[PDB]
Every structure is written in C-alpha cells, then in structure tokens.
Ligand binder design. Structure first.
Ligand code: HEM
Ligand SMILES: [N+]
Length: 184
C-alpha cells in the first residue's frame, strides 16, 4: 500500500517542469520491493499539449526486454501534485489498453530545477497492491545526482544511499516517441 503524503516543492515552477522535454530516471527508491525489478529503465516527457497537461511514460526492463509506453492527461490536486489516469499505447500513440477507473498514478514533484528533480509516485493498477516509489530525474540521462537533488532527498528524510541507480543497464531511449506521445 502507499503510505506517503509527499510534499510538493515550495514555489514549484510548473511551466518549467512541464515544458515538453524529457526527464530520465537515474535513481529510484521503491518502499515495497519484491514489487519492482532491481534493474530497470524509465523516462517521461511532461508538457502541455493543446491546453491539456500531459505526461508520456516509457518503461524498459533491460533483462527481460519488457517495454511499454503510456500517456495521461493529468488532473491537478494542488501545485506540484497530480492524478494521472493512464492509457497504455505503442510508441506511436495507438491505444493498447484504454483509460479506466482504478488505473491511475499520483505524481508529486518534491524538488525541481532546470536539470534535476525528485518525485514521488503511487501507482494504482486494478487489483494490484500499490506502493510508494521515489525517483531522481535528470535532463541528462548520464548525470550523477548533484548536491541540489541529493539535499532534497535528505530534506524528505530519505537516504540517497538506499536509492538504486539505473546507470549500469545500457538504457537507450526514444526521445522522439516520448515528445510526440504528449499530443496523443
Ligand atoms: C516517473 C516515474 C514513474 C511513473 C510515473 C511510473 C508509472 C507507471 C505506470 C502508469 C505503470 C502502469 C503502466 C500500464 O500498465 O499501462 C507502471 C508500471 C510499472 N512500473 Fe512504473 N513508473 C515510474 C517509474 C518506474 C521505475 C523507476 C520502475 C522501476 C522498476 C518502475 C517499475 C514498474 C513496473 C515493474 C511496472 C509494471 C507493473 C505491473 O503491471 O506489474 N516504474 N509504472
Ligand atoms: N511504477
């Protein structure tokens, strides 16, 4: 189950975060593992498309090759805190699994600047158990976590040493698909 009410960044700059560009997950902390794989790849694009707040997601398991994309129109709970009802799509935006009640994630931006971010997410997917997942993001897929985002991890009363890196997985991303999925 999810247990955290994550606090959004004071003074969160939504237009900068939701600028249409890509964010890569560099490190993550799942509070209820044996539930996500140790080795994983994920990225997202976040932007406004025709007036609608959107996120496109990519997941890739580098060992199994399991791959999937999603798109959601985000609803606002408060500044920096969103609810996202997702649809599974192919890379071109064709629907594989339609939006449904009970398929949603929450999304809280705890820290962001132009190059880095710390987010919390709680995924609800049908009758699957939910659990808290924190992710350190960067605009540069290869960037080591810097002092701004590591300090934010500490300020959330988390230990960065517990986060698992994605950097050793040979992750290659289709940035073009993520950007184009924002419109879909
Ligand atoms: C921005 C961060 C992330 C968000 C918003 C997010 C969101 C989601 C969503 C919406 C799904 C369901 C997709 C679908 O069924 O259509 C999903 C599935 C999954 N995610 Fe993430 N995810 C994120 C990062 C990660 C990371 C870093 C991992 C690490 C392993 C991960 C592991 C998984 C796994 C294993 C599933 C499949 C769940 C299942 O059906 O059993 N995710 N995620
Ligand atoms: N997830």
């Amino acid at each position: 189950a999810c247990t955290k009410n994550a606090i959004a960044q004071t003074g969160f700059n939504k237009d900068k975060y939701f600028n249409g560009d890509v964010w890569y997950v560099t490190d993550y902390l799942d509070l209820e593992p044996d539930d996500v794989p140790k080795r994983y790849c994920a990225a997202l694009a976040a932007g406004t498309a025709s007036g609608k707040l959107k996120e496109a997601l990519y997941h890739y398991d580098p060992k199994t090759q399991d791959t999937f994309y999603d798109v959601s129109e985000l609803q606002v709970e408060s500044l920096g805190k969103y609810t996202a009802n997702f649809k599974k799509v192919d890379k071109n935006g064709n629907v594989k699994v339609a939006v449904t009640a009970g398929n949603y994630y929450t999304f809280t931006v705890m820290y962001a600047d132009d190059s880095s971010a710390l987010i919390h997410t709680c995924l609800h997917k049908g009758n699957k158990a939910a659990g808290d997942l924190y992710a350190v993001l960067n605009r540069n897929k290869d960037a080591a976590a810097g002092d701004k985002v590591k300090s934010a991890v500490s300020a959330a009363t988390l230990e960065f040493s517990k986060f698992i890196s994605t950097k050793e997985n040979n992750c290659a991303y289709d940035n073009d698909s993520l950007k184009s999925l924002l419109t879909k």
